[PDB]
Amino acid sequence: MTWEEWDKKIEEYTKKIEELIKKS
Amino acid sequence: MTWEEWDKKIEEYTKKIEELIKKS
Amino acid sequence: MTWEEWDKKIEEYTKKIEELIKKS
Amino acid sequence: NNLLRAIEAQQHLLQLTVWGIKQLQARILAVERYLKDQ
Amino acid sequence: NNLLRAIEAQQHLLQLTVWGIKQLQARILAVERYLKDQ
Amino acid sequence: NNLLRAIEAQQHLLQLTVWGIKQLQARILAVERYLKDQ
Numbered sequence: 001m002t003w004e005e006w007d008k009k010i011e012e013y014t015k016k017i018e019e020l021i022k023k024s
Numbered sequence: 025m026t027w028e029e030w031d032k033k034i035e036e037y038t039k040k041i042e043e044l045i046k047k048s
Numbered sequence: 049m050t051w052e053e054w055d056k057k058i059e060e061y062t063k064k065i066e067e068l069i070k071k072s
Numbered sequence: 073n074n075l076l077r078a079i080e081a082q083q084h085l086l087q088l089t090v091w092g093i094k095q096l097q098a099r100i101l102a103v104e105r106y107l108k109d110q
Numbered sequence: 111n112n113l114l115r116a117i118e119a120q121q122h123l124l125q126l127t128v129w130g131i132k133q134l135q136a137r138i139l140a141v142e143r144y145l146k147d148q
Numbered sequence: 149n150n151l152l153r154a155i156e157a158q159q160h161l162l163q164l165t166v167w168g169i170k171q172l173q174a175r176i177l178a179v180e181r182y183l184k185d186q
Contacts, residue, residue, distance in 0.1 A: 001129070006126060006129070006130060007094075009122075009126055010123065013119050013123045014087070014090075016119045017083055017119045017123065018083075020112050020113075020115050020116040021079065021083065021116060023112040024076050024112045024113050024116065025091070027173060030088060030091070030092060031170075033084075033088055034085065034166055037081050037085045037088070038163070038166075040081045041081045041082060041085065044074050044075075044078040045078060045155065045156060045159065047074040048074045048075050048078065049167070051135060054164060054167070055132075058128055058161065058164055061160050061164070065121055065154055065157045065158060065161065066121075068153050068154040068157060069117065069118060069121065069154060071150040072114050072151050072154065075113065075155070076113065079113070079116050079117065079120065079155065082155065082158060082159065083120065085162050086120065086123050086124065086127070086162065089162070089165050089166065089169060090127065092173065093127060093130045093131065093134065093169065095173075096173060096176055097133075097134060099176050099180070100134055100137050100138055100141070100176055103176070103179055103183065106183065107141065107144065107145075117151070117155065120158060121158065124158065124162065124165070127165050128161075128165065131165060131169065131172065134172050135168065135171075135172060138172055138176055141179055142175070145179065145182065145183075
């Protein structure tokens with residue numbers, strides 16, 4: 001994996017988590 | 025943000041989490 | 049703590065978490 | 073509830089570690105480049 | 111439920127920070143060794 | 149319950165990443181200073 005793919009995976013999962021926090 | 029502000033934010037949230045873990 | 053002890057503690061807790069996620 | 077508050081505070085913790093990790097990667101990269109340039 | 115999904119996504123986040131931290135430690139170690147060897 | 153145990157184990161995981169990140173920052177800082185001093 002690269003740091004560009006890392007940066008993106010981080011953002012993807014940060015977004016998911018933030019929506020799961022509102023849903024809950 | 026600096027590493028001094030980082031160190032402190034880390035500790036602040038570590039403390040909060042530990043109290044939320046006991047409360048639960 | 050060393051990086052060898054770190055690597056192992058990481059794996060230990062990753063395993064625990066993954067079993068707690070299935071149990072739940 | 074308190075459980076949700078835990079998870080939120082853990083999320084703040086994580087975002088702080090992400091911040092530190094990006095700082096460190098840029099800094100280590102700048103050093104590698106410096107040594108290469110030298 | 112959504113709560114469990116949060117925790118799973120947080121776990122994925124964590125594993126990503128672990129990955130970055132191991133990358134950085136190997137890289138900083140290689141630089142320290144280079145300077146020592148020089 | 150198991151959910152709380154997950155969160156606790158995640159908290160231990162996080163504290164380990166914080167430890168690594170502080171190790172790496174001190175080490176990268178010591179290298180930057182070394183290069184500056186040289």
